[PDB]
Swiss-Prot record, chain B:
Name of the protein this chain belongs to: CRISPR system Cascade subunit CasB
Lineage: Bacteria, Pseudomonadati, Pseudomonadota, Gammaproteobacteria, Enterobacterales
Observed phenotype of the null mutant: Loss of resistance to bacteriophage lambda infection, loss of plasmid silencing. Increased levels of 57 nucleotide crRNA and also 2 and 3 spacer-repeat units.
GO CC field: protein-containing complex
Induction or repression: Repressed by H-NS, activated by LeuO. Activated by the BaeSR two-component regulatory system, possibly due to envelope stress. Part of the casABCDE-ygbT-ygbF operon.
General function of this protein: CRISPR (clustered regularly interspaced short palindromic repeat), is an adaptive immune system that provides protection against mobile genetic elements (viruses, transposable elements and conjugative plasmids). CRISPR clusters contain sequences complementary to antecedent mobile elements and target invading nucleic acids. CRISPR clusters are transcribed and processed into CRISPR RNA (crRNA).
Native source species: Escherichia coli (strain K12)
Similarity-based family: Belongs to the CRISPR-associated CasB/Cse2 family.
Subunit structure, interactors included: Homodimer. Part of the Cascade ribonucleoprotein complex, with stoichiometry CasA(1),CasB(2), CasC(6),CasD(1),CasE(1)-crRNA(1). The CasB homodimer forms a cleft that cradles the 3' end of the crRNA. Interacts directly with crRNA, CasA, CasC and CasE. Stable subcomplexes of CasBCDE-crRNA and CasCDE-crRNA also form, both of which are able to bind target dsDNA. Binding of target ssRNA or dsDNA causes a conformational change in the Cascade complex.
UniProt KW keywords: Antiviral defense, RNA-binding
Gene3D superfamilies: CRISPR-associated protein Cse2 (1.10.520.40)
Molecular functions (GO terms): DNA binding; nucleic acid binding; RNA binding
Gene name of the record: casB
GO BP terms in the entry: CRISPR-cas system; defense response to virus
Curated annotation (Swiss-Prot), chain C:
Annotated function: CRISPR (clustered regularly interspaced short palindromic repeat), is an adaptive immune system that provides protection against mobile genetic elements (viruses, transposable elements and conjugative plasmids). CRISPR clusters contain sequences complementary to antecedent mobile elements and target invading nucleic acids. CRISPR clusters are transcribed and processed into CRISPR RNA (crRNA).
Protein name as annotated: CRISPR system Cascade subunit CasC
Listed GO CC annotations: protein-containing complex
InterPro entries: CRISPR-assoc_prot_CT1975
Induction details: Repressed by H-NS, activated by LeuO. Activated by the BaeSR two-component regulatory system, possibly due to envelope stress. Part of the casABCDE-ygbT-ygbF operon.
CDD domains recorded: Cas7_I-E
Keywords: Antiviral defense, RNA-binding
Top-level taxon of the source organism: Bacteria
Organism name: Escherichia coli (strain K12)
The protein's assembly and partners: Part of the Cascade ribonucleoprotein complex, with stoichiometry CasA(1),CasB(2),CasC(6),CasD(1),CasE(1)-crRNA(1). The 6 CasC subunits make a helical stack forming a groove in which the crRNA lies. Interacts directly with all of the Cas subunits. Stable subcomplexes of CasBCDE-crRNA and CasCDE-crRNA also form, both of which are able to bind target dsDNA, and at least CasCDE is able to form R-loops. CasCDE and CasCE complexes have endonuclease activity. Interacts with YgbT (Cas1). Binding of target ssRNA or dsDNA causes a conformational change in the Cascade complex.
Amino acid sequence: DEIDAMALYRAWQQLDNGSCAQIRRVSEPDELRDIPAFYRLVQPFGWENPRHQQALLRMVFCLSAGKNVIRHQDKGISLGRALANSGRINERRIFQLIRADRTADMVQLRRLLTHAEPVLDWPLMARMLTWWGKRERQQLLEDFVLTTNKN
Amino acid sequence: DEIDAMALYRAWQQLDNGSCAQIRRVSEPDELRDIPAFYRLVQPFGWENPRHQQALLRMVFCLSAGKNVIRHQDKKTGISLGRALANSGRINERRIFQLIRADRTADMVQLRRLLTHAEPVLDWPLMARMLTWWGKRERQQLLEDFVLTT
Amino acid sequence: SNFINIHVLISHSPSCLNRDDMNMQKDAIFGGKRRVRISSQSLKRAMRKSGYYAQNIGESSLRTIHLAQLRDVLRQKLGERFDQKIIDKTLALLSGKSVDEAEKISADAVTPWVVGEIAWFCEQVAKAEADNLDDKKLLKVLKEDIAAIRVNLQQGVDIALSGRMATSGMMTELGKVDGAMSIAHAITTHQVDSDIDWFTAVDDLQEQGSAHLGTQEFSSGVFYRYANINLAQLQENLGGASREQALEIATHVVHMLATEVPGAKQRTYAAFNPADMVMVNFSDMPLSMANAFEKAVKAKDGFLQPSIQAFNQYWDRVANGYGLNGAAAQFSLSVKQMPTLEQLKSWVRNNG
Amino acid sequence: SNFINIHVLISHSPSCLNRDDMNMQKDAIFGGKRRVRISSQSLKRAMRKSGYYAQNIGESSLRTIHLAQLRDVLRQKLGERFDQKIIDKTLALLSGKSVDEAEKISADAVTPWVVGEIAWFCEQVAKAEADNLDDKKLLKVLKEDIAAIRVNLQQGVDIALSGRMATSGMMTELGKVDGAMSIAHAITTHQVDSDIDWFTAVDDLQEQGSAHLGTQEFSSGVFYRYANINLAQLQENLGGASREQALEIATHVVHMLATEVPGAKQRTYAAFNPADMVMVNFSDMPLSMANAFEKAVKAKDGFLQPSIQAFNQYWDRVANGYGLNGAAAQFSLSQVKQMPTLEQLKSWVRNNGE
Amino acid sequence: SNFINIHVLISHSPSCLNRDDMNMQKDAIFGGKRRVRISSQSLKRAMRKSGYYAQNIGESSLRTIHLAQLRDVLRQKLGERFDQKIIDKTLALLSGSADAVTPWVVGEIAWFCEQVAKAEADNLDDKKLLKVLKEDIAAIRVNLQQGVDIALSGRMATSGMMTELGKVDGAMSIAHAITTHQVDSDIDWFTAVDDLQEQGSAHLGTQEFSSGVFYRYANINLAQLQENLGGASREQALEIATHVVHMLATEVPGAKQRTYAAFNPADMVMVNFSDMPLSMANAFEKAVKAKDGFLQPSIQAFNQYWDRVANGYGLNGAAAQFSLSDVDPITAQVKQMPTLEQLKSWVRNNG
DNA sequence: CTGTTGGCAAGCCAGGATCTGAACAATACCGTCATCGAGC
DNA sequence: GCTCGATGTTTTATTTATT
RNA sequence: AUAAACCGACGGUAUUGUUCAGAUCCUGGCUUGCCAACAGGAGUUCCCCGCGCCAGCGGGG
């Protein structure tokens, strides 16, 4: 019972310019529940199932930073290692992500993605966005601090 | 392969006031995962390798008791932790029992409290090995050292 | 059915109701996970010393190893019924120890005594030496009929429920009682990592700091009490009581097991919680439900709801699998639905 | 009935009323979820040291482990009534410690002392001295009547309520007390993720940065205080007092448990909140309603309303389930006699629940 | 097949169901790790003395053995060593159309025949012979009214049997019960409070105790059971086997049970037929690690083990598995049973 | 039927001290060799 | 067929470490 | 059918009573989100029906 992350990535990359343009326009993830093209995208990924649908909200909202923002690589590079590898993010901003409340965290993450334009392993990040909670924030900070401090 | 415990000791010793102050206010070992200064401290000592992770959590907690609470003193085996705690003459035996009988995370809290009280003089790499393993044998040994010394 | 099975699910707020040699909470590994434990002996003594027990069942036995102090007590209590000599010799015959005027006379081990039972016995001793009947033959004669002595155990029911052994004296032959009931240690249905209380004692003549700094282990818990009464044995141990009397006693055991909680650290933690769930079941052979909690209950809007649910599910699995159909009543509060504990108690009183 | 149960639901604005050795809030896992905690001992000290106690009950006990300081204090306070020799001798008998002129004499542990009680003992020791009575024999004959000593506990009620332990001295026979009042650690009905105040200290002679940086854990909460008084024990501990007196004391305990709040960090967090809900339940066996919050109360226009809700509901369930028909009287700020004012509840408790 | 293999997984709450001369839990090293143990003798006694056993095996129908009906086959069997005079005299004094005969009966009767022959040779009889052989006769009589108990469990500790043929092994073999996982036992530090002692308690002690998921194994020699029942049928043997299954699934030693009360039933019972009896204990040679309890991983490990080795070990043959859990099942070669009774009936009908 | 791109994301400096960590009482008993002849 | 009781024989080795 | 066979280590038991973690403390100074833009194109609509100039109009769906 897991969302095929790579399939969703491909679905987004192949999606018509119009629909994805409609999706990027959203300001916060909940607003995605008012866009038709959204459902049209996340329908073959079990949007009917609630847990899957919160997960999907986050995943799509991160995928809507741009279409060439998140260059999916493949072993795997975590989000922390990626944002650290960009060299464009300072630690205080990562803190400003992991301390942010509901919805706001996703916005800050979107801005961080636009800013860093990270090369990462997407399915890993998808798993992270699914269990978005104290453990993933923690390991995010861990990866970021380590990768930064090695340089 | 094995954690350079003295290097970690000196590292902790010449750490800036800030990072140190951040590591100190932790209230249980796992919380050290929230402090960036911790990662920057233990990264050269093999943190990105899991076994080392657990060991280092214990070590850095015990050190987080304070910069001047664990006095390293070279070998003339060397002063074991139990011996040190007894040598302080401040620690009641019953507390040592309660320590060696305790369970995970609680044991480290109680140990840090004991260390804070005794301010022990000991062979630090030795205690570091002990913390690395920390099986039931090590805890019994702690208790028996403490008893034989008094 | 011969067996009365009592199951209790009881939640306790933060407390420390049972500790070991080092004042830490008693625990037990179950299903690979640590559970907080309340020992069965603690439960039994908590029950037998309760006000309810005193009002409804009677006097708890007198458990002691100090035979001199006991001698004095019996003299004070059985003095206007017997002469001191007979009392002394009776104690000396039951214990196997010489009862003189020593300051300290010690028995073989801690042993439960019933004052009434002793009275009956010294009646027998009186009528024995009066008929010039020595001690050995007296032992034979008394060995020929034990039921009477067990009616003297009707005067000390906790011995009829929990049992008694003796290694010395005539008790060795006459006081050998196998407990009627049977009871398990209370273990939590979930894993527990016990909290620690860092406390200080503030001195009113010491301005600087405190006079004591210490730690105290404690925790919250959803405990599973189990206890089945053997019944035919309860009838035997009471001298041949009826099934009604045994059923009523069992009812009292249900009430106590549902409501009694050890007084340990309750003047400073006060976990005076009654059982949220109680279930009684008649059966041919004993059945414990502890394996409902072999897989530790994971929290879900509390530990109590998933515990009761898990209990019910396992109960159904067992009943369906082994084809058990003994009468059963559950009282719940969160097989029977028992709006009140009293209805469940009367239901038990009436053979189910 | 014998048992007076006291339930309190009280909300505190963000604060830190009880902390450990790490300046962290005291907590307790209940129903699988963290609850901010206020220990019983803190409540008790906050009560016996409170102005209300002093004005309504009297002087609290003198709790100390330093027998030298205590020696001096007793020498001063009883010097107008006893020879220093028998004051010293008395303290030495009670403590099981030798009292000379040492600057440092330590007891076994922190012990509750009542000056009037020790004075009474001084009268006794004086009489024994005048009758050339062996110290052992004095212990014997004094052991034959604990009641009087407990009247001397009338002069120190906090001991009568919370008890006293003894490991050395004559106290081990004469001074052991079972607390009448039992009380629980106040725990939040809901889950709590405590916040952190990251503070500075600005040095007026330092331009670049602050002199100190730190963090302090704090949180708001809806606490469930529970405390039942045992009563017959309260009459016994006071030397055979009357039920009426015990009821007056119990009433005072209700007031305090409804109004008294620990002084910790109140100078900088000032969570001086009075209790919104107070139910005294008269009854026959001790009963705690903590399990009403076993399932963590979830927020719904506050934690207060849903908490009083859950409490009332579980109260009903238990009441009819176990057939508890004792008296039962409650007071609130929003079969169970309802009271508009706390004072009417108090007056109700004084009248044996009528 | 000739053998019935009975496998049981049964989980016990904190208890001490079998100890040694130091009151320590019995254990055994398996796969280099300590397992708590319940000895074979304790388990088998727990069965043999149980009420269920007494009702269904003790008071069985084939219980009583009539020396009368056994006259002819005895007459030939012993007829080669003794003549019919001595044989009939023996039979008649013992008692005061059968096809076959239980070997221990033949043996003991043959001994009695030796005795009465040597009694005639020396010139003696009357109450002399009936006082020399009083206790012996009493014995053989009590045993002659316990045929099923003797066939299943073997002769009792004090039997009266006198011949090499009267060394009756039970038909059932019970292995020691061992836990499927490593166990570090718990300690209970208890006090005994004196009601006459002010300071402290009157006794202090410790009691070792532990939980545990146990694996009971037992097998039944059908042929030997029939032969020890005077040439009974396979079906009757299967009824006895049914009872053995029930007892091995429900019976628990009474040791320390008054105070720890581990009255737990089996969570899994499997029965399979084979020519070679095998224990599936090697399913737990690598000690089972706990994942949400020790029970589910134990059953799972059992299933996986069976799936792996059953074919090669020649365990092909009838196999049924009653279970309370919903863990992924065995190979489809094993017939699943929802109630214990359906399993027992599956056993009655020869699988 | 059709939805875009570039360019850019900061630095300084600062995290404390005082003082305190308990005592008493209690840790069991039985049986798991044998002989002989006597009294019962 | 036993339970009773006196009775054949014989014991002591220590005492501060560190996976 | 193996130093095998047959074959319980058994019974009794509160770890108890006493206890603030506490006093002091700005997170603070600087900063456009900005530049381009018709919502227009495109009559497929699958039936029953009534009246025609055959172009196309209606009522019921």
